[PDB]
A paper describes a structure:
The question addressed here is whether the 8-oxoguanine DNA glycosylase responsible for oxoG recognition and repair in humans, namely hOGG1, interrogates DNA in the same way as the functionally equivalent bacterial enzyme [name], despite the lack of an overall structural and sequence similarity between these two oxoG repair enzymes.
On the basis of this screen, we have selected the Y207C variant, because it crosslinks efficiently but is substantially distant from the active site of the enzyme to participate in the catalysis and does not interact with DNA in native LRC, and crosslinked it through the X8 linker to the minor groove N2-exocyclic amine of 3′ guanine of the target nucleobase. The structure of this complex, herein xLRC (with catalytically inactive K249Q), reveals that the active site as well as the overall structure is identical within an RMSD of 0.201 Å for Cα atoms (a total of 2058 atoms) to those of the native LRC16. In the xLRC structure the oxoG is extrahelical and deeply inserted into the enzyme’s lesion recognition pocket as observed in the native LRC complex, confirming that the introduced mutations and crosslinking through the X8 linker do not interfere with the extrusion of oxoG into the active site of hOGG1. Secondly, in the LRC, F319 and C253 interact with both π-faces of the extruded oxoG, which sandwich the base in the active site of hOGG1.
Numbering used by the authors: 9 to 79, 83 to 325
Amino acid sequence: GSEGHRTLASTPALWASIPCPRSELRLDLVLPSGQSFRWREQSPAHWSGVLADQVWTLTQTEEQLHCTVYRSQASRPTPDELEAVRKYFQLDVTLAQLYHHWGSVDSHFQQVAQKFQGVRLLRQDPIECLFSFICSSNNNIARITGMVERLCQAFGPRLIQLDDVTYHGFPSLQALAGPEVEAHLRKLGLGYRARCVSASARAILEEQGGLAWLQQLRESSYEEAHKALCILPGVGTQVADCICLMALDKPQAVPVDVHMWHIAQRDYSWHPTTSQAKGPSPQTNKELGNFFRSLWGPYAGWAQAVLFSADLRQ
DNA sequence: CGTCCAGGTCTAC
DNA sequence: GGTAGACCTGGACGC
Ligand SMILES: CCOCCOCCS
Ligand SMILES: [Mg+2]
Ligand SMILES: [Mg+2]
């Protein structure tokens, strides 16, 4: 009871609650669906991971999101700590209101939304998001998830151990820019993305003026932010859109991968009309992103997250 | 066991 | 501009 990952049943006094209906949040549809790669369902309905530099376990009942933290004596999370959870889930954004809107303007969205409630966007750290999505390219979620864990294990600071799992914070730019990072990441199975991690960490610190440059894209425009990210090695349109949506507070950013292509054709009979290219291409991928913005409006990326997630499950 | 595929990015024509 | 091929890996899918 004192050791291992906590459950709600087994250590009741160490949990605290955040009011939040399952209609506003389904952990099981958000945490393994390729937004963040850093959460594991270590016991049934309990998700463990690192969030604002500490380890947490999260579980839900119909009206509550229950939260425990591992930091000192074992105790309930504090009000300030609980805030970090609220911010990470962006719980001020009311998902019932967005679903209504998207539902009204798109009857296909209405149909999928009935069976896939509580899919919202996490608000992620820019560095973690940048380097996770560099690992995402031409890859599947199961393998990306391992790549990311091994990366944090080798280069990130040791937080705490539960059972046989040692949690690590996400690596700094400095660690990722270090000597022989590529060769090390190649032995950890990252393949060609090993080079991209080293190169982007160095590009940021040595050519772009460091962490500040990345962080300040939050206050910049989607279009400025998206252009700025594309200069980095391993960061194309898609990876940049993932970062803008998931880390830089750009809700209108819509990543366009093979899933979204399939969704467009199957469920909207979409075809490009500004370019003569039949398939995925820079100009057809731009157009498809514009189609979804025009359809769903300024939170189109959030709508994308609902159908993307629902397409993973089918 | 050989292709094909997964939250693509690159350069080269 | 739209197009093709190279780059890691390891599960799923046939033949
Ligand atoms: C998909 C292969 O290209 C990845 C980005 O270019 C190489 C720099 S690390
Ligand atoms: Mg606690
Ligand atoms: Mg780039």
